[PDB]
Amino acid sequence: IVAAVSPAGGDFSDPVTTATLGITQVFWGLDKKLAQRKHFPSINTSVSYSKYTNVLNKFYDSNYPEFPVLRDRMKEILSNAEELEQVVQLVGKSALSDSDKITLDVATLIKEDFLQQNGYSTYDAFCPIWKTFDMMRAFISYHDEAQKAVANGANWSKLADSTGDVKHAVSSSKFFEPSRGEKEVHGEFEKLLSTMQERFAESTD
Amino acid sequence: IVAAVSPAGGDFSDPVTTATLGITQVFWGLDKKLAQRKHFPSINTSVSYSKYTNVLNKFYDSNYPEFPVLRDRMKEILSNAEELEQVVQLVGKSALSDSDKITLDVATLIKEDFLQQNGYSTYDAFCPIWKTFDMMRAFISYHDEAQKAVANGANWSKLADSTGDVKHAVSSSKFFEPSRGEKEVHGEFEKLLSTMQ
Amino acid sequence: AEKRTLIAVIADEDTTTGLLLAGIGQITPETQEKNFFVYQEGKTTKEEITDKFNHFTEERDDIAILLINQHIAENIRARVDSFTNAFPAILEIPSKDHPYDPEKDSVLKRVRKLF
Amino acid sequence: NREQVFPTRMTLGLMKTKLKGANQGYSLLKRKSEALTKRFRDITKRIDDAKQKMGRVMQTAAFSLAEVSYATGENIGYQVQESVSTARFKVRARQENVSGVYLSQFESYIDPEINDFRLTGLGRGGQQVQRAKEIYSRAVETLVELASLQTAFIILDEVIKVTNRRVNAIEHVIIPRTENTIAYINSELDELDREEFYRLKKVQEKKQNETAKLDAEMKLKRD
């Protein structure tokens, strides 16, 4: 059952929103913030939730994908980056640390290269399960590699200096191709971790 | 006639309270801030008032002051401490005067040593009129003496590190076994006040 | 800050001699480290200057004031400008054969801008 | 801006009070920024004046050292460095309230346990050298005070910036957010009251129609 509710001004106080949210085991919300900017499909990470997500994780484990882990990690990164946004908007961008900045940069990367997919495009219009899973996995790998590199005593900016290649590569995973060539993507991720190792070698020195 | 309305959440918008306001001769308010903070029984500072206070003072004319006329003074101390803390919250412990430090410590003391009453505790179950007047007099004494000491050229820190017993003694002045041992507590307190110098 | 009561110095012969004469110098008996070091423009390497700067500024919790000759400070103007902490306080002073240039002082330069 | 879907009316009071109070706090932070700016400005002019003092002081100290060196012949550096152990001249950090801002100031400390310098084999000229030392003692010490005025000025700037940042947040941010919250809450509450008033109007109309039916029944009974 898929039913569209059109509350006045998008307010949850409308009878429609409440009555809908009451009997629903899952709800996908639509935001007018990124829709007004002609940005891709807009969904609130602080609003949209599903109660069927658990059995969905159990079902996604059939493909031996990690739905729950990647989703919780990305949601935590999103919440921490949102709080980081509140703090940066409060004081400034010079009042934060390297890890928080990495969280904000990762938030931007997840915003531009993941949640936003052009429906009019010949690629981003439809995203396969394996494509999104590999994208989230490679994103998590780059995030873990960056977090580990930051723990080695390297600055986030200095780490972001030689990582432009991996960044452009992570942003280029939206186009890709048909079912054939998934190996090229996973391999590109391996080349990304290897690139991280090369950067580590470069740092010393 | 003792009536208690049940306003939801502690809102002053209560129709019960709204209709009961234009009638009742006495209204004792309960602050939602003090009640949910796990603090002793809630009383709003500025809101609580009595129109029978004048007649009650006329009836206290026979029972004399302390704290009949000292109620207006304690009201001055608490209201001024409220006006001071309102800024202090938006200022902090950084920039303040000596009279201000005395006023804040006076608010904390007036909170710990006066308003707080525990019905569950056997000793704190109830306090006498003379006992509460004794604790209030003790507070008014330590406060007026602190204000006098500030005008004598004495700092806040040295004075605070000077007497640590006076606070614990001024705070326990609420009976706790009234009323026979009143004059004795008055003597020990006055003796401490004269021994402070 | 409260722990900062000692003065460290990096300056030429005359300055070091004068300041040590004043009685500002002190040697920690346990660490055998000193709070004074005579400096030479030709002989002392920039890396040692930057090292001493970083050590005196961040590695020690007991440094209150760091004295430095203007001639010496010019060599590490970068590191000097890079220092923005209130403690230790930064004061550029002249040396022999090297008068004090106001614009050379990194902190004073920073203050000069926006005047 | 920021809008809350569910509002009572007490929430409107809390938001309004928090808004006015944050406004007053904004005014306080603004005046404080003005005073801190003036103070940091005076401390800045005093800092430049102190640098221009500092150069002359350095020249004087160098001159004193030269005079002592000429007087002594002796190798000053060796004996001097050898006679260093513990500071006779130390410093003391203190806290001073200055126009609202609490600042750390430095106070010169002279250990009486540590004796003055006693050069041997220098004789009378040694005393001259003592005088030279006095000069340095008189000089750089004051400079250290000026240095404090410098550091405290720098921090006075940074903190002033912090105050300005608060002014930036209390201007188009907090004030506008509170305004939007109060407006949306006012609209939701007034609309809800309008709906309830509509239900009441329909109820009263129902009573009036039922009463009119009663009247019609009475007329019918009369007929």
UniProtKB/Swiss-Prot annotation, chain B:
The protein's name: V-type proton ATPase catalytic subunit A, 2nd part
Species per Swiss-Prot/TrEMBL record: Saccharomyces cerevisiae (strain ATCC 204508 / S288c) (Baker's yeast)
Gene: VMA1
Phosphoserine PTM positions: 62
Swiss-Prot record, chain C:
MF (Gene Ontology): proton-transporting ATPase activity, rotational mechanism
Annotated localization: Vacuole membrane
Keyword set includes Iron: no
Keywords: Hydrogen ion transport, Ion transport, Membrane, Transport, Vacuole
Biological process annotations from GO: endosomal lumen acidification; Golgi lumen acidification; proton transmembrane transport; vacuolar acidification
Family matches, as InterPro entries: ATPase_V1-cplx_f_g_su (IPR008218), ATPase_V1-cplx_fsu_euk (IPR005772), ATPase_V1_fsu_sf (IPR036906)
Quaternary structure (record): V-ATPase is a heteromultimeric enzyme composed of a peripheral catalytic V1 complex (components A to H) attached to an integral membrane V0 proton pore complex (components: a, c, c', c'', d, e, f and VOA1).
Miscellaneous comment: Present with 4050 molecules/cell in log phase SD medium.
Family: Belongs to the V-ATPase F subunit family.
Protein name per its UniProtKB record: V-type proton ATPase subunit F
Species this protein is from: Saccharomyces cerevisiae (strain ATCC 204508 / S288c) (Baker's yeast)
Gene from which the chain derives: VMA7
Swiss-Prot record, chain D:
Complex and partners: V-ATPase is a heteromultimeric enzyme composed of a peripheral catalytic V1 complex (components A to H) attached to an integral membrane V0 proton pore complex (components: a, c, c', c'', d, e, f and VOA1). Interacts with RAV1 and RAV2 components of the RAVE complex, which are essential for the stability and assembly of V-ATPase.
UniProtKB keywords: Hydrogen ion transport, Ion transport, Membrane, Transport, Vacuole
GO biological process, one term: endosomal lumen acidification
Lineage: Eukaryota, Fungi, Dikarya, Ascomycota, Saccharomycotina
Domain of life: Eukaryota
Molecular function as annotated in GO: proton-transporting ATPase activity, rotational mechanism
Coiled-coil intervals, chain numbering: none
A Pfam cross-reference name: ATP-synt_D
Residues making up the signal peptide according to the UniProt record: none
GO cellular component terms, semicolon-separated: fungal-type vacuole membrane; Golgi membrane; membrane raft; proton-transporting V-type ATPase complex; vacuolar proton-transporting V-type ATPase complex; vacuolar proton-transporting V-type ATPase, V1 domain
PANTHER family reported in the protein's UniProt record: V-TYPE ATP SYNTHASE SUBUNIT D
Organism listed in the record: Saccharomyces cerevisiae (strain ATCC 204508 / S288c) (Baker's yeast)
Family named by the database record: Belongs to the V-ATPase D subunit family.
General function of this protein: Subunit of the V1 complex of vacuolar(H+)-ATPase (V-ATPase), a multisubunit enzyme composed of a peripheral complex (V1) that hydrolyzes ATP and a membrane integral complex (V0) that translocates protons. V-ATPase is responsible for acidifying and maintaining the pH of intracellular compartments.
Gene that this sequence comes from: VMA8
Subcellular compartments: Vacuole membrane
Membrane topology: Peripheral membrane protein
Protein name according to UniProt: V-type proton ATPase subunit D
